[PDB]
Design a protein around this ligand. Structure first.
Ligand code: NA
Ligand code: NA
Lengths: 232, 232
């Protein structure tokens, strides 16, 4: 499915910064109205300072739509995960902590269940062609491949992985490769959607979810058009 | 390196049939004279009937050049392997038997050493993107992936694998993927070289050996030009 996404800084919708106003709820509602089955929020404020996690805003946004929302942004502890779920989020997106403390995060899978957690990985394809995991675009590789890290969490029932290629718009071997290798996992693609043809290009790769953020804000296409393209 | 190749049927050089004469030795000698470090022969007569293995011809050809030759064609038993080595071949190319009886072939690695054996696999990329092994272009998939079969032989020190893509000329994700995954193995590519640009396209993939057969017979380029291209 198409997964429309917003990034939020102190209540403001931003592009990766470009300011798109302080109306996240009507935007999300219109995404849902066009048929989106899942939405994605990134709490950039919380990612910078966990004490400033925008729980009240997140609570309002979730309450204001009729579809599950996956939310990420500096999720560091068990308490972070529980607080988001409690605020009504459907799935918590775990990024750097999943690279840095797998034994701890494996425990979270056991407590919350794999249906409640999405593992978000940044991938650089190195000179040799290995899928190197990195915790952000501005940090060096962490010394683990995408496959190794995925296989670390398969024993606790990993179901949802969000992959961003940070070595690369999409108009796809990477997605074809990992989706074929782990057909029991639903992979999401993030980044590289500049226009509608980028979505078409992901068709057939095996990717389950296509995250779309800035192209919608920029008015390149609508959620309805993205879904029509995706469903072909 | 470039690995010039000939297929032989009852002493005749053939193209995959087109007849190119009964002068395999002067052809091989000229390949070597242009700088080839390794050559490849396929005994198509032996592949059809082991009793008719062209050992006397192979013995003459090997003796007539100054470079190692890898030879394949219906290698089915330990006795086949030993007979070829004895006739002076440097490496024996094992195809279908490596798919069908891995425990037996693993024993051959222990007896002869990994430097003496090349595993030749035909690969079809299926609808899901899995690298499916098949024993020939005219048979269905065998129910094992390239990765699974490679990992079967890694414990006995597998070093040389010759991969033909039989689902596809090359002008390469497949080669990039497997070479990156198993950097301790020297992979050879076979097929899909129609012109010199097909060799350039394999540069950077991680492939060690590029088998070139029909393009040389057809006069598209020379061994010297292929080597110049490959070495860049
Ligand atoms: Na570093
Ligand atoms: Na069959």
């Amino acid at each position: 499915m198409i997964i429309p996404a917003l990034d939020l800084i102190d209540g403001t919708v931003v592009r990766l910064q470009r300011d798109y106003g302080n109306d996240p709820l009507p935007r999300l509602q219109d995404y849902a109205a066009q048929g989106a089955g899942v939405l994605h929020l990134v709490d950039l404020t919380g990612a910078k300072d966990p004490a400033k996690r925008q729980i009240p805003l997140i609570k309002t946004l979730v309450a204001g739509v009729n579809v599950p929302v996956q939310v990420g942004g500096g999720v560091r502890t068990e308490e972070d995960v529980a607080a988001l779920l409690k605020a009504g989020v459907a799935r918590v997106v775990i990024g750097s902590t999943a690279v840095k403390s797998p034994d701890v995060v494996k425990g979270w899978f056991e407590r919350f269940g794999a249906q409640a957690l999405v593992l978000a990985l940044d991938v650089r394809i190195d000179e040799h062609g290995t899928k190197q995991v990195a915790v952000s675009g501005w940090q060096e590789n962490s010394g683990v491949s995408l496959e190794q890290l995925v296989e670390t969490y398969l024993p606790v029932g990993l179901k949802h992985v969000r992959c961003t290629d940070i070595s690369r718009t999409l108009a796809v071997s990477l997605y074809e490769e990992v989706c074929a290798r782990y057909p029991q996992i639903a992979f999401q693609s993030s980044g590289g959607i500049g226009d509608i043809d980028d979505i078409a290009a992901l068709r057939g790769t095996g990717v389950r979810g296509v995250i779309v953020g800035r192209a919608l804000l920029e008015g390149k296409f609508t959620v309805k058009e993205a879904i029509q393209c995706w469903q072909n």
